[PDB]
């Protein structure tokens, strides 16, 4: 059945995860009570990828909700689709993580992680053929970042032959909660480098710039940012949720070198509330490749595409899709490495997302992503050179050496991208 086990950790992880399940529950026709009320059997074809079928033909998401304080998850349980989640899959503590990677990874999180693994094991055991895991979290906080990456490490040890996939929100000073986010993000990226196969890099400043510059939102909220994320998560999981397409074949074709598995996602259209105008296939294709539609705040013209995955949704001309996709890479062939032939693959899906007749989702493995890790590295070093705010972490048992190593690991990752941007 190629089941996927979903995990959302921390405030950001649970808020974007909640929106994700609300979006795809609507696409598959599942209501807030888990009852199916769709009109197309295409909605139930691969519904078992994300949903378990309970008694009465109810559909329960295969989702585990994790946090070190109850606040954000209480609001999920009281949210629109809060009732579709299995109550047993809410695992939370009370102390919180204080935006502290050490608390999430070493102290507060360590005390709770075994409880989470018990639920993961219960969901995995009842899988006919487990594909792997999908984790939503931020890297700037404490729970999603620190306990999220601790969870990934424990999951890999118990399921070493399964695929690990994350949606990872990268912090930005433009949309910041605390000054320590670069510390938490730098410590997490190394965990991700070693223990994930595919990571969608979602940059909060990109999301902000899109809400402000393009969507014409004067004062974007986290809710507005999460609208872009849920629409993007629906797009990048379309090929997994409808006939066509699993996490391993995606990794095999998207990841030519094991460490370079950090993707830039994109979405089109993203229109300001003009929302009724039809979009032609050429327009979808140009916007989907446009930097302004990328979620990583990286300039693709500053690097090269190792691999690209594209997904077109809606009723349209596949002939015209192929033509426009060939036109993009035939007119800008300099931005696609020549040592990976035919590194752009396109999928189509007749089911469009809610509100749009046509949509295009972009998944790029570009060397330009190094600009994201370089930003984090600079912000990290600016504080670390003065050991600023370190006491929050040494107070939890960490020592300075572990920060020096995280810094070096980050700069090696940046260098590895640079060697292929010129090779």
């Amino acid at each position: 059945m190629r089941e996927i086990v979903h995990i959302q950790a921390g405030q950001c992880g649970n808020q974007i995860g909640a929106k994700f399940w609300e979006v795809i529950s609507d696409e598959h026709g599942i209501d807030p009570t888990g009852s199916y009320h769709g009109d197309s059997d295409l909605q139930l074809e691969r519904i078992n990828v994300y949903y378990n079928e309970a008694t009465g033909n109810k559909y329960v998401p295969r989702a585990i909700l994790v946090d070190l304080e109850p606040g954000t998850m209480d609001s999920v349980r009281s949210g629109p689709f809060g009732q579709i989640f299995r109550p047993d899959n809410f695992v939370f503590g009370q102390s919180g993580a204080g935006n502290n990677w050490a608390k999430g990874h070493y102290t507060e999180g360590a005390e709770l992680v075994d409880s989470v693994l018990d639920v993961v094991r219960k969901e995995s055991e009842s899988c006919d053929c487990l594909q792997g895991f999908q984790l939503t979290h931020s890297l700037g906080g404490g729970t999603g970042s620190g306990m999220g990456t601790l969870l990934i490490s424990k999951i890999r040890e118990e399921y070493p032959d399964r695929i690990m996939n994350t949606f990872s929100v990268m912090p930005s000073p433009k949309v910041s909660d605390t000054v320590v986010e670069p510390y938490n993000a730098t410590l997490s990226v190394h965990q991700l480098v070693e223990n994930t196969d595919e990571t969608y890099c979602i940059d909060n400043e990109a999301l902000y710039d899109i809400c402000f510059r393009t969507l014409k939102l004067t004062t974007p909220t986290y809710g507005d940012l999460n609208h872009l994320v849920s629409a993007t998560m629906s797009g990048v999981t379309t090929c997994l949720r409808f006939p066509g397409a699993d996490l391993r074949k995606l990794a095999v074709n998207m990841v030519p070198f094991p460490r370079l598995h950090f993707f830039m996602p994109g979405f089109a259209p993203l229109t300001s509330r003009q929302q009724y105008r039809a979009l032609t296939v050429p327009e979808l294709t140009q916007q989907m490749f446009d930097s302004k539609n990328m979620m990583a705040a990286c300039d693709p013209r500053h690097g090269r595409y190792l691999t690209v995955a594209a997904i077109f949704r809606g009723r349209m001309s596949m002939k015209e899709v192929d033509e426009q996709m060939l036109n993009v890479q035939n007119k800008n062939s300099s931005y696609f490495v020549e040592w990976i032939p035919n590194n752009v693959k396109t999928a189509v899906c007749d089911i469009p997302p809610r509100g749009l007749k046509m949509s295009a989702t972009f998944i790029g493995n570009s060397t330009a992503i190094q600009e994201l890790f370089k930003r984090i590295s600079e912000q990290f070093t600016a504080m670390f050179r003065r050991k600023a705010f370190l006491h929050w972490y040494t107070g939890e048992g960490m020592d300075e050496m572990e920060f020096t190593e995280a810094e070096s690991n980050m700069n090696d990752l940046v260098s590895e991208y640079q060697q292929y941007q010129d090779a």
Binding site: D322, E323, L326, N327, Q329, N330, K331, S333, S334, E338, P341
Partner: protein, 348 residues
């Protein structure tokens, strides 16, 4: 936007074509190893024809005809003329030639015909050529000819030397007529309006074949072994206008009537012969190619074909015009951009 690649940096003709293409703003040059090109200016040797026409959404065109080497190699050219019914072994415009392997071989047939001439008192002077170039021997005895071929170590051809060439006056000197011919993807044959005569500056001396400054008209031999180099014409290059005026004032005839009709006939014959073997009509990629035909005219105003060059150069004064013509009929015909034609279409 159209894209192309350059894989022969030594090509003077297509270095200008590349400059013209870029100068239009509607063509973009890529890296020599990028496969997403519309147009390939391929290398002279081992051009990978097998990798063309397999790029979805790209009409691909190359500036060489796969298989045209049969026409542009001195050995295989003789084989082509002797074994092709269209160009019979008795065609009147190609000198009697034989393929001689130093170490399928016609060494015995050459001696037989040599003895026929040796028996009678008919002119028995032959010339030996090969692919090295840059290696030519003109002797009256067969022994000396065959001996030089075994010492070189390459496939050669023994061809009858034109003992009675047409001599330009003043000077009493030999010459050569280069013609540029363009064949497009539809296998239209275009003869460049402008030809060039490569003339010897030394007076043709029938007594001494050792001094090959008057017998050989190659521009390289004249610019290094000729004391009168550049005396009669600039760079020993006479163009059609002057040569035509000469034929009128001296021989009371025109270049078109006395020579150009035979040239067009020869060009048409050679190219029509191999059309089934090299045409890209129904092929998954398209080809065009610029050829250089070399002709010799005897004193009876009879034209003889001596060689066909598949990667020829051009005359300095004619580079601009010809290269622009290439872009117009060979490249822009397949890839249109956004009448005083310089070519003569040899219909067939």
């Amino acid at each position: 936007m159209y894209t192309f690649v350059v894989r022969d940096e030594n090509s003077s003709v297509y270095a200008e074509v590349s400059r013209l293409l870029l100068a239009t703003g509607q063509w973009k040059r890529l890296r020599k190893d990028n496969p997403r090109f519309n147009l390939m200016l391929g290398e002279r040797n081992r051009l990978p024809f097998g990798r063309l026409g397999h790029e979805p959404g790209l009409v691909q065109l190359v500036n060489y005809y796969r298989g045209a080497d049969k026409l542009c190699r001195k050995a295989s050219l003789v084989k082509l003329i002797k074994t092709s019914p269209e160009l019979s072994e008795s065609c009147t415009w190609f000198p009697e030639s034989y393929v001689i392997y130093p170490t399928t071989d016609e060494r015995e047939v050459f001696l037989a015909a040599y003895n026929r001439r040796r028996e009678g008192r008919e002119g028995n002077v032959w010339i030996a050529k090969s692919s090295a170039g840059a290696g030519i021997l003109i002797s009256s005895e067969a022994s000396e000819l065959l001996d030089f071929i075994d010492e070189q170590g390459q496939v050669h051809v023994i061809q009858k030397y034109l003992e009675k060439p047409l001599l330009l006056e003043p000077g009493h000197r030999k010459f050569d007529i280069r013609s540029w011919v363009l064949v497009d993807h539809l296998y239209n044959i275009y003869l460049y309006r402008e030809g060039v005569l490569r003339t010897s500056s030394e007076p043709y001396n029938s007594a001494n074949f050792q001094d090959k400054t008057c017998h050989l008209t190659n521009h390289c031999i004249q610019k290094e072994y000729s004391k009168n180099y550049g005396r009669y014409e600039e760079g020993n290059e006479m163009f059609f206008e002057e040569f035509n005026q000469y034929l009128m004032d001296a021989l009371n005839t025109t270049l078109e009537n006395s020579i150009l009709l035979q040239i067009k006939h020869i060009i048409r014959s050679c190219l029509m012969c191999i059309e089934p073997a090299i045409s890209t009509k129904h092929l998954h990629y398209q080809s065009f190619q610029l050829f250089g035909f070399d002709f010799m005219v005897d004193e009876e105003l009879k034209v003889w074909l001596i060689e066909v060059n598949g990667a020829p150069a051009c005359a300095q004064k004619l580079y601009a015009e010809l290269c622009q013509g290439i872009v117009d009929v060979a490249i822009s015909s397949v890839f249109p951009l956004a009448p005083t034609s310089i070519f003569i279409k040899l219909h067939h």
